[PDB]
Structures are given as structure tokens and as C-alpha cells.
Ligand binder design. Structure first.
Ligand code: YNJ
Lengths: 313, 313, 313, 313, 313, 313
């Protein structure tokens, strides 16, 4: 609704990566639903579960109808084919949905959603107050300005003691980094099991007659292309999340200093925000510094004295 | 619209879970419409209604053309296949639309829809009132505030007589819990009955010539995957519903305790709500306490007296 | 628009049942147009136009190619398969469309649509006027109050002589009831006729060589399930329609005795409504009584006297 | 826009019949594009270019491979199948598009579209004035009423010169009637021609060996059902068009005798509208007469007299 | 949004024709990508690379398997089918997109889009200004009308030097006429080259054994139908384009002879617009002359003198 | 939003070329997913692993059933076909997506984004002001204008010291030119490796019997058509990008030469903009010069002085 301003730049690359993951997931899924077949032929000469590889040339007769071929194709497709070759689109679709849910649960949780909406509402009211220009460069605007002043005071009293949003943003990025590490741990290890050629040895003699078969999975090359693209793209995602975790654990976003604003505004009476509002204003500062610049005048008591003097006279 | 206030955190997890149940339901349904076939071959040697399992190898002939393979496939699909393997996506689709209808019958019933929409209008009027900023710490505003006071007084007089919302939410959550209990009661009993290869015996010798057949159901592994995922999802849904039922049966939702804000807001004359209105105030408090903070000053005769003094002056 | 307040609860359950019906209708239609198959085999030994049921086992050779099988499938699909087994989704789609048209013809007809929209506009205007709170408990507001009194008197003179809305809303329900009766009286009679096993005898010897054929319709069980579900759902629809028709012939909706609100408010000089206005006022009372209760003031001559007195002083 | 005022009730039934016509057209079209096959077999014993119909039973061997069957199906489909069976959905698609274009050409033509939009703007402003209440039963309202009076006078002097709206409505309804005559002229004549059993004699002996063939067309019954449904829809559409053409040819909508409303409103100074505005006022009367009731007071010389004396005092 | 008033009547028929060209193009394209095959048979007796047409009837045996038939189908589809039968839908799709680009480049170009936006904004203020009625038949209204007077005066010298809009609207229509010319030269000369019977002699004897084949393209009739429909639609489009070209070369659109308003309105002093603004005046005159009628009072020095005297008094 | 003000004519042609690139990419992609088959036949007589090309004729018998035909089709399609014939739609889709991301990174990056909406906000507010006409031709307008002088002075003091927008808009165009160089370098080099006829000698003798095969790729002509169309589209894209890069490198884009307008606007005290704001002023002047025309009056010292004496007197 009104959360568009509260997203830093690392949550835009995250959004586009997470939507292209979903589109390649549904592409692989509709491919595997569409065909994902296997073509298998029996080997006449066998030497310990291996095809022995033994006027004009003529064809080789196997004495099999089409439906025995279908049966052995299904059986060799299930039993002697790796599980990663079959359900990889479903795995990446599930992981994409878990990434999306982990990204948007912070917004959709009502306990922090209320605080976010309240903060962005008073931020828009602070930005739209015309008295900032007179404070930084008569009466009725005095009453709307004092309405802003005491409701900003009420908000500062209301949200200072909390510790919830910073903890949520800790846990979200922590589980995102851990899940990225697990995905890279298993995917590159199991990606080599997809291959065009596969040999099944099922021991179903009473239905066909032969024992070992030579199969051919035709979608293996395209699935390897999709898997390699997915791995490289989730490396990019993991580096982005690692950088934002390092930034948020390095800048010590619990508390906010406010020296660089008072040094230019020459308002010597300004306090420092303690926690859970300092981090939120750090986030809007990483959006831009000007929105935090115009939030300065609604906290100085000398600005309050100037406002009440202009109201009285 | 503005009904997001009226939903706690346990009623958006329910919605998201219902969406993902509906997606897996429609995916299983379109798969079952798309193929859901099976491949059946006759066993040449039969022992106790089971297949006996008995220079170069050559294929086994059956002297059966393709169309009577199609016939025996259809017959052994319709007769000797367990019905849970066939209609599981339709079953879970039916269950998720029952869950959606139960979760939205609270809002779509007009006798409660009117009460909630008028309550939302009253609360947005109370929240948007500028006089609460003065109250928690000038004639037309006072008259508008007095109109607000009289309208919330008659609204309180109106909705205190009912008891419909609390009992509907009771009879909604309890049937959601019993639906969860029955779903888990039967689907884990029947989930073991889907499998890849199945032996069918349908007694058609006048048409094919053989008696018993060995079949293969190629979608069994993926349907078992989807069924296990659905069972785990139903478990998490049921734990959420049992938690909210325990909360509503423990907290004694009918009455309101309001002294906890009376003692700090210094308005020693506030009443205790009887039923069907204190429950909704508890629900808004479960969203956030601040909307209940701003509703404190609108029900106190000292506050109407202060407004009367201000209107006199 | 805002016509949701103009539909009772027995026209919302109808609106959901009659879209579930369309959903199962389009599902059955796409299934029937997608598969549309039945598999047929010839019986070599025949008795009374039924199949006689007569080293290792070997297949039975009919010496037919695939295209003869296709031809006999088409012939036994049309000539010896019952029409209810084929066009049932189109029948239920037609019934659902006629039900929806009968439900919304009342709204879409302009001669009553004008009365309904101008009615709901004056009720919304009477709801939103601020003088109602003062009257149930400063001259410009009296001017709009006098204008609204005049237009309410104009409405009362305008709509008191008609009967078209009541006549249409009774005729729609009675033809819905008779439609429900027709649907149940043929569908449960013809629902037993679909089955998996069908025998066809079509007299084509000059083309294939055989006389009678044993067939198989694989969609029979799913179509029977859909038909039974449709019958139960139409039964629920008909019960709702019977209830509302009994309500209309019970409560005698032509006139409205308006005693309770006048006794509660002590405005003893109020008249009763003749017809075609009491109907919509009964409907909005079935929505909620407060819209009618706050409509009481704009008809009372003592309320007119108080309005002109407040205009005078 | 808000053109629902400018549509009589017979243009809504038309606008829904044209939708269901489009629906059956697109359904028949997609079914025909999907299958529309026909299965052909050769007759071994032929007399006078017709199939003569001359221990256990055995099949009849033609010694033909599948791809020749496909060739003879294509040939007997393209030559000896009547064109009404093949192109009926495309014909009805073209027809319903011509109905939609003929319905909306009266709106999309700009020379009349400007008059309709400016007319409906004037009627909404005249309907939304509070001065007509006083006219039927303080200075700036008189001034804006005078401005609206001048606009009404300018509109009356402007549109009194034309005839184009009535001319176009003639030219639309008469060609709708002619198109009805043409459709019912040929379609009921040709509808018997589609049928299931179809014979062909295409003179291909050098490629197959046989001369005549017997064929089957498995969609013929469904196409006959769809054609009958389309015929009934055309009949209903044409009855509606005949009724509205007859009504508008007998009412003589060029001029309006305005006597019957001011004989009871007691505003005797009213003229009769000559052309192109009386027809539009009859159209909005067929919507409802109250809109022209509230437009009647804004044209009376005694009404400007009362307005300007109220401006004087 | 409100760009519709700039479009003449011939630019709307052009738009709807371009829509129906697009839908027939996409229908032909989806049909061609769906099937577009042909069925080919070899003929045993050959004369001049054609087939010579030289106890019961028996079929002809060719000893070709299905995959050889598929190969010869592919070869005779690619090498001996005319290119117009294959790429006609994509060709007409390209032509439709070119026509749409030629009709919307006049809007999407910024140097003319800004001028059109300024023209439509100034004409809507001139339509909504209330001083026009008083001129053709209070101090702040006259002052803002003076502001609009000077804005119109500066716009007049802002647009009196250009020619870009007229140049672009000339060039677009003349290249559309050129494109119609090219379309009519090639498509009627090439439309005769599709038919049901096509011969191929492709010289693949080492793989099959036969030399010449006779094929059957089963979509030639429907493609001929679509091509004839497209040809007639193109002819109608071109007649519209020739009409607007003749209108542009005949009516001398560069300057406007504006007197037809001034002898009617007795405003004896008015100038003649020279170029690039009189063209826009013609363009809005083709919509309706009312907008040019109301623009006269915002361009006459006697009208600024009257407003100046009125603001003085 | 209204951000079309920022895109010149070369930035709209680029977007339309990109979207038609995307539709031809997805068309080729869905076609390749849908069929992309290849039909292969063995060659009986072999010379250097190539086909030797050697009463009525009869077919050549290969003694191959359909399933090993499918196997050899898959093997020859995977091993002995160039990868550009198979992954061209995926490649061009990737290039289209990276072009779109490169084009929209200038908007989606927040550090420059915020500067863009702040700049466009002050530009629309300057265009919306009514005092520019008075400047280039009562007192609260003077106060509003003074406030907007303070706002534009704040904008000028803030955004002037940056360079990031100019740096990013250079870096985007340079990599678009680099991508053009790469695409034209490799695509036309590899475009000739798609062909109708392909020979595969894949050494599968113990499964089929033959050694060399002749194949036919039925999509090669359509893929070559699409490739040529894509190359021409890339060429147009690259000429547009090279032109705008040359304009950017040549026209000394960093600083504005504003003195050409102060002689006619008679405000000689206007300075030249240093950097990163003159880029935006060029980028709006490319749209239209009026927005820069009426931007002189809001920054000139004599303009604030004339407003000062207008407020004083
Ligand atoms: C085993 C002896 C058969 C003899 C036969 C003759 C043809 C020239 C030599 C003998 C007839 C026939 C029909 C077929 O269609 C069957 C339809 C299956 C396609 C479904 C999916 C798709 O559409 O792909 C197929 Cl596939 C073949 Cl192979 C053959 C032949 O070989």
C-alpha cells in the first residue's frame, strides 16, 4: 500500500532475482509436465551389466510391440533415474516461494505493519508541512505545526522502547543467508547426476524377455543449462544478502548519532534516538538523506519556542 | 478495503496456506486431467493370482494389437485401482473451498457485516479526530466532536444488545478444527494405498485371452509427494487453529478490562463493556493497542464535560 | 455500485451456488471436449445380443487395423450411447446461465433499475445527513433538511402507486422454484443411465465383419460423481428458493406497519406505507433495521414542525 | 461512460444475445479447429455408386496402411463435405461482429457522439439542480440557474437544425431487420445438410485401389445442436428488432407534443420540439419519464420570470 | 485519455480495421503453427513427372513405414510448397504492426505530442470558461480570464511558426497509401498459388525408392478464404486512405478562413490563422464546429477590451 | 507516473524495439518447446561416412520399428546438431531482458530515482504556477511564489554538487553499445549453421544396425527467418544507441549555456548551471523547450526583487 519508500536498493535486486527464479521454475515445471519422457532399447549382448557393443547393413529385430516399449520406458524412468533430474523445478519453485515469504512476512506481520504505517504517515505529514522551509531557511499554520509537534512527540514516546523490528530484520536476513548456504551446499553437489545416457538393469524378464536396457533422457542438456543458470543467479543473490548482512552488523544500527544535521542547521539542542526508531530512520536515511534532514526541525525545543512565539505574536 | 485491521496474524497465515493448498490442488487436478494413465501387460504364467516370475534373448510375443491394450488399460484403471489415487486433487480442492467459505462466511453474512462495517466507520472517525491529540495531553471542532460523542454513545447503545459476532466466530473456528481433525484422520490412513505397480484381475478372457495383468502407475511418486506436502500443510493449519481456539476459550473474550489504561490516562470514569463489543475491541487490540488507546477518551462523562466547557467558552 | 445492501442473505448463497454450478459445468465441458472417447472390441461368440463369455495362454486376433477401430468407436459413440452421457455439461451450463439471468433481470431492467438506484441514493443521503442525530436525540443545514423533506415527499408520492418491483421479484422467485422442480424431476430420473459398461449393436457387417461389440466409456464414473454433486447442489438451491417464496407468501409484504420505531422514539404521528415502497423498506429492514429506524424522522409532521421552528429561530 | 441512460430495454437484450452468440461462435470455432476430423473406410462391394451391403466371424482386410487412410480422409473431407458443415462457426462469428458494429456505430460516429455526450451532460446538470424543486413547488444560485438557462437555450437553438440521430437509428435498425431476413432465409434451408453418415466418390484409384468410400463425421450432432441454438437466438433477436422498428415507425418520434405534462404541472408556456431533440427526449422517456419531468421546468418563460424576479429580490 | 477528440471519423474505422486484421493474422498464425502439414503418397506409374491414372478391389501396397512417410512429408513441405502458403499470417502480422506504427507515430513523437497536449488543454479551458457565453450573448473571474487571454496570446505566437505536425500528418498518410499500393500489387498476384493438389519431384530415391509424389495440403481452402478476406479488408482501408488524401490535397488545410463565425457573431475584428494551428482547428472542426465557435471570443481585441471595461466596472 | 517527460525520442523507439524483440523471442521459444523434432533415416550405402546417393518401383525396407527410430532421432538431435539451432530463442530472450534491465536501472536505482521525482515535482509545480505569465508579460500569490523560490533555491543548492545521474546515463549507453558489438559480432557469424539437411554419423551399431543417417530439421527455414529479423532489429537498436552516445559525448552535456534566452526575457541576472542539473535541463529541453523557457523566472535576482516590491506596494 505505502511501503514503497521503505525498501533499500538490495531489496529491489532481490525482488527481480526472486521473480526471474519463479519464471524459470515455472518454465522447467511446464517442460517436465509436458514431456519429460525417456526412450529405452534393450541390449542383446551383455557383459556384467554392460552392453558388449557387438552384404549391406540391415536393421536389428527385437520382437517388441509399442506398449512393451512404453512399459519398460516408464519402469526405467522411475527406478534407475535420479530424483534430482525429475523434481528440480519443484525444488526451485518451493525455494523461490520460501524466499518471497521470508521477504514479505516482515511487511505482512501486523505488529510491525502498524508501526511502519504510523511512521510513514507521520513522515509524510512532516514532509508536507510548509513550516519546515521557514524553520530551516502565520498563526493557523502555527496550529497545524504544533499538532505535528506534539504528535511527533507522542510517536517518539510510543516507539522508543521497542526492540521488535530490528530483531525481525536480523532473523530474516540470517535465515536467508543460511538457506542460501544450504541451497549451494546441495545443488552443485547433485547437479552432475543429470545426463543424456543412463543404463537401467531392472530384472523384469517375464514381461519383455531382455534384462538390461540402454536409455536416453533427452531433456538433460536443457535441464543442465537451467540448473547452471539457477546456481549462478543464486550466487548473485547470496552475495547481495551477505553484503547487506555485513553492512547492518557493521554500522551498529541500534542507535543513531545526529551530529551532521545539527552542525549545518545550527540547532544546538537535539537528542540521539536510542533504539527501534534509530534503525528505522537509518533505513530511511539509506533511502535518502533529505527525508531525514527535514525530520530534524520537529524535535528541537528551540524550534518549539520559535513556533509558539510566532503563534502568540 | 479497510478490513485489514479486523484480521489478526493467525488469519493471514490461514489465507496464505489456503492459497497454496488451492495451487497444489489445481496442479494435481490439471495433471490428472492431462494424463493419469497406466500401462498394463499380461503375465503369461500365473500362480495364485500372481505373476510367476519365470541363444541370445528375444522379446516375448502376446498377439495383442494396440486397441485391446487400450481396453485392458481402461478396465484395470477403473476396476482395480484405489479411488483415493484417482480423486485426491478433487478432494483437496473441495476441502480448500470449504475452508475458504468457512473463513469468509464471517464477513459475507449481512447481519454481522453491517455491525463490522459500522464499527470500522466509527473507529476511523475516532482515529481521524484531531481532538484526541488535545485529550490525551475551537468551536466548530468542538461541535463536530460532540456529534462524534453522541454518535458513539448511540452506537454503544445499539451494538451492546447483540451477541452474534462472538458466537459465529466460535462456531466458525470449532468447525475448522473438527474439519482438520477429520482430514488428518482419514488421509494418513489412505495415503499408503497409492503405489507404482499394481496387479489387476478383471476376468475378461472373451476379449483378450489372458486373465491377470501387471500394471504400472507412472504418476504415483509425484502424487505421493503432493499428498505428503498436503498432509504437512494441513498439520500446520490445524496447529494454528487449535492455538486460536485455545486463546479464545481461555482469555474470556466477552468482557473488557479497561482499568489498565484508566489508571494511566487519569479518566477514572469509564465503563466495562458487556458482550459482542468488547470482543471486537479485543480483536482490534490484538491488531495493535493504539486504536484502543485513542478510543478511551470518547466514552467518559468528564470528557463530555470538558468539551461542554470548551463549547461554552 | 453500492447495491450490496439491497440483496438479502438468501441472494448471496444463491449467488455462490450459481457460480459453483458454472465452475463444474465448464470443467465437465472441457473434460468432455478434451477426451470424448470410448473403447470398443468385438465379441466373437454371441448369444441373445450379448457376449457368450466363453499350451500357454495366447492372445485373440481380430484382424482389424486401427482405423476400423476408430470407425466402430465413432458409430457406437453416437448410435448407442445415451444423450445424457454426452451433453450433460452443456445442459447444466444452460441451466446455470438461465438461473443467473433470472436472478439479475430484476436489476438490469431499467424500469425498476431507476426506482432502485434513486431509492438507494435517497437512503444514502438520509443516512449521511447530520440532522438525524439531533432529531433522534444552523439554518443552512435546515435548508438542505427542508429540501430533503420535500424530495422525500416527492418520492413517497412517486413510488406509492406502482407494483412493478414487487411483481418482478415475486415472479422471478416462482419461476426459479418451478425451474428447480423441473431440473430435479428429470436429472435424478436420467442419472442412472450412465455406466462404464455399454453394449452396442449397430449392424455394420459390410465394413468390419463383426456384428455386436462390447465397449467401455472411461469418463462414466467421473461424470456420475459430477452429476450427483450437481443434484445435491441444486437441491440446496431449491430449498433456499422455497424458503424465500414461503417468506413472501407468509409475511404479507404489501403494507408495512411501522409501530415499533414510533413507539421507541415517541414520534406518534407517522403513517403506514401502502405498497411498492414497503417492499424495499422490508428488504432494507432484512438487511439491518437501523436504515429504516433513521428513516423514520423524514416522514413525521412533528419533525417538520421542529425543522421549521429551528429555521425560524 | 454513463451511457446507460441512453439505452432502452430492448438494447440490453440485444447486447446479451450478441454475447451468447459470440460465446457459441467461439466455442464451435475452437472445437472445429481442434478436431473436425472424419473417418473413412472403403466399400468392397459397390452397386450404382452405393455400398451394396452384399466358423466364427472374422475381420475384413483392406491391406491399407495408415497414411493412405489419412490421405483419403483429407480428400473426402475437402471435396465431398458440404461447406456449411465446415465454416458455420466462422460465419456466425462474422455475423455477430456485424451485429456488434451495427449496434455501436451509433455511438462511435463522432458527428452524433458529440451531440449525445453534450446532451447527456446537460441532462445530468439539469437533473442535479436544486432549483427544480422550487420550480415544481440565494442570489448566486439564481445566477448559476441563469447560466444553465442560457446553456439550455443555446442547446435548443443548436440541435434544432439536424436530423442525423434519428436518421442513423433508421439506418441501423432497418439493416438489422434485413440481416435477420437473410440469416433466416439461408440457415434453416442449409441446416439439414450437416449429417453423420456421408458418402464420397472422389476418383482416386491409382493411389489406393478402391473407388468409393463410406465415411463418418463424429461432430455432426453437436454442430446440429449448436446450429439449432443459434437459429433460436436469431429468432429472438429478430422479434425484438421487429418490435422496436414497428414501435418507432408508429410513434412518429420526429416531434413531441409536450401537452400531457404541463397540463398538470401548470406551466402553460411551452413549445413543441421540432426534430432531432424530441426523438432523444422520447428515448430518455423510455428510460424513465422523470428525467424529462425535471427538464421541463428549465425551459418555461414563467420559470425565467420567477428566476429573475427572485434575482431582483 | 482525452485524445479522442483529435481523431477524425476515418481514423476510427482505420483503427477497428487494424484490429480485425490483427485477429485474423493471429488466427492464421496459430492455425499454421498448430498443424500446417500435408499428406503425401507416391504413385507407381509416372508420365512426364505426373501420375498417368492408368476378383474384388484390393489395396495398393507400398512397403513404406510411417517414418519414411513423415520424412517425405517434411521434404515435400519444405522444397516444393510455395512460400506464400507458409508465411502469409506472419507477413500480414508484420503489415498490421507497420500500419499501427504509422498511425501512432504522430502521437508518440514528443515534438508533436507536446503541441497536441497544449492544444487540447487550451481548448478544454476555452470550453470550460464561463465568459464565452456572456461574450456571445466577477472581478476575479475576469482577472483569470485575462490570464487565459495572455496565455492564448503567447501560445498563438508559440505555434504560428511551426509546420511539423502538418508535415508528419501528410507523410504518414502518403506512406500508408504507398504500403497499400505494394500490398495490392503482390498479394493478388500471389494468391492463386495455393491449392489442395501439389506435386513434388524432390529426388530422394536412395532413401525411399520412389521418384515422384502427390501431396495434399489440407488447409489451402481456409487459407484462401482468409487471404480473400484480408484482400477485401485492405481494399476498404485503402479507399479510406485515398479519401483522406484527397481531402487533404483539396481543402487547403494550411490556413483557415475564419469569417464563417464572424458574420454570424458580429465580431467584426478577428485574424486568420496562418499555419500549423489552423490545421489543428480543421482537425477539431472535423470533430465538431462548436469548439472552433467558442474559440473566437478568446481571440478578438474587442473581447479583451470588453473584459477590460468590465473589470474596470 | 508522468515520467514520460524524461524519455527522449530515442528512448521510446528503444522500448518498442525491445518489446517486439521480446515477442519474437517468446514466439520462437514456444515453437521450439512445442515441436523442434528432427526426422532421421538410415543410409544403406555408405562412402566416407556419407550416403552414396544410389517392374514398378517398390519401397526400401529398413526393418526398424518406431521406437528405435525415436531413439536415433533423439541421439542425432542431441549430439550432431549445432547449439545455435536449439537455444537461439533463449539467447535472444536473455538479451532482451538484459537490455530492458539496463534501460530501467536508471529509474529503479533509488539514489538517482529520488532526485528524478524531486526534479519532476518542482518542474510540474513551476509549470503549474500562474505568476510566470505576469513575469514574462494579489499578495498571497506573492507569498506562495516566494515559498516556491525558497524550494527551488534549496533544490539548486542541494543537487548541484552531484554527478551520479550523468555518470549512470553514460555508463548505460556505453554498455548498450558494447552489447551491440558483441551481438553483431557473434550472431551473424553463427547464423549459417542452421540448415534443413544434416548428416549424423553417431556410432550406434549395436542398437539399430546402421551407421550413418540422413536427417531433416523441419524448423530451420522459420528459424533463419526469425534470426534475420532479429539481426535487422538489433541493427536498428545499435544505430539509435550509437547516435545518442555520439550526441552525449559531443554536445558538452555537463553545463548549460543559458545566456541565449536572457536577452529576450530581459532578466540579465541569471547564471549558468554548473553540473548534474544542466543534464536534466537538456533532458527536458529535448522533450520541449517551454519547461526550460519558464524556468528562468524562478531563479533570477531581479525576479525576486520585482516580487518583493510587488508585495511591499
Ligand atoms: C505393428 C504393425 C502396425 C502396421 C502399421 C503399417 C503402416 C506401414 C507399414 C505397416 C500401421 C500403423 C499405425 C500407426 O499409428 C498408431 C497411432 C499411434 C500414434 C499416437 C501418437 C502420435 O500421434 O504420434 C503407427 Cl505409429 C505405425 Cl508405426 C503403424 C504401422 O507400422
Amino acid at each position: 500500500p505505502a511501503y514503497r519508500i521503505l525498501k533499500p536498493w538490495w531489496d529491489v535486486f532481490t525482488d527481480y532475482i526472486s521473480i526471474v527464479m519463479l519464471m524459470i521454475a515455472v518454465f522447467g515445471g511446464t517442460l517436465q509436465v509436458t514431456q519429460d519422457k525417456m526412450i529405452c532399447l534393450p541390449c542383446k549382448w551383455v557383459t556384467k551389466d554392460s552392453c558388449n557393443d557387438s552384404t549391406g547393413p540391415t536393421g536389428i529385430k527385437y520382437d517388441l510391440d509399442r506398449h512393451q516399449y512404453n512399459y519398460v520406458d516408464a519402469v526405467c524412468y522411475e527406478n534407475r533415474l535420479h530424483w534430482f533430474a525429475k523434481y528440480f523445478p519443484y525444488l526451485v519453485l518451493l525455494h523461490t516461494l520460501i524466499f518471497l515469504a521470508c521477504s514479505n512476512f516482515w511487511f505482512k506481520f501486523p505488529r510491525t505493519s502498524s508501526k511502519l504505517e504510523h511512521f510513514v504517515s507521520i513522515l509524510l505529514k512532516c514532509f508536507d508541512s510548509p513550516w519546515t522551509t521557514r524553520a530551516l531557511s502565520d498563526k493557523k499554520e502555527g496550529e497545524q505545526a504544533k499538532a505535528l509537534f506534539e504528535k511527533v512527540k507522542k510517536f517518539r514516546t510510543h516507539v522508543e522502547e521497542g526492540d521488535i523490528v530490528y530483531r525481525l530484520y536480523m532473523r530474516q536476513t540470517i535465515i536467508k543467508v543460511i538457506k542460501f548456504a544450504l541451497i549451494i551446499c546441495y545443488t552443485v553437489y547433485y547437479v552432475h547426476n543429470i545426463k543424456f545416457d543412463v543404463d537401467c538393469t531392472v530384472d523384469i524378464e517375464s514381461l519383455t524377455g531382455y534384462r538390461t536396457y540402454r536409455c536416453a533422457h533427452p531433456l538433460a542438456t536443457l535441464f543442465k543449462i537451467l540448473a547452471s543458470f539457477y546456481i549462478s543467479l543464486v550466487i548473485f543473490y547470496g552475495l547481495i544478502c551477505m553484503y547487506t548482512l555485513w553492512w547492518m552488523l557493521r554500522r551498529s544500527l541500534k542507535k543513531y548519532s545526529f551530529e551532521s544535521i545539527r552542525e549545518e542547521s545550527s540547532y544546538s539542542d537535539i537528542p540521539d534516538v536510542k533504539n527501534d526508531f534509530a534503525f528505522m530512520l537509518h533505513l530511511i536515511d539509506q533511502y535518502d538523506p533529505l527525508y531525514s534532514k527535514r525530520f530534524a526541525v520537529f524535535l528541537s525545543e528551540v524550534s518549539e519556542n520559535k513556533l509558539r512565539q510566532l503563534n502568540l505574536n
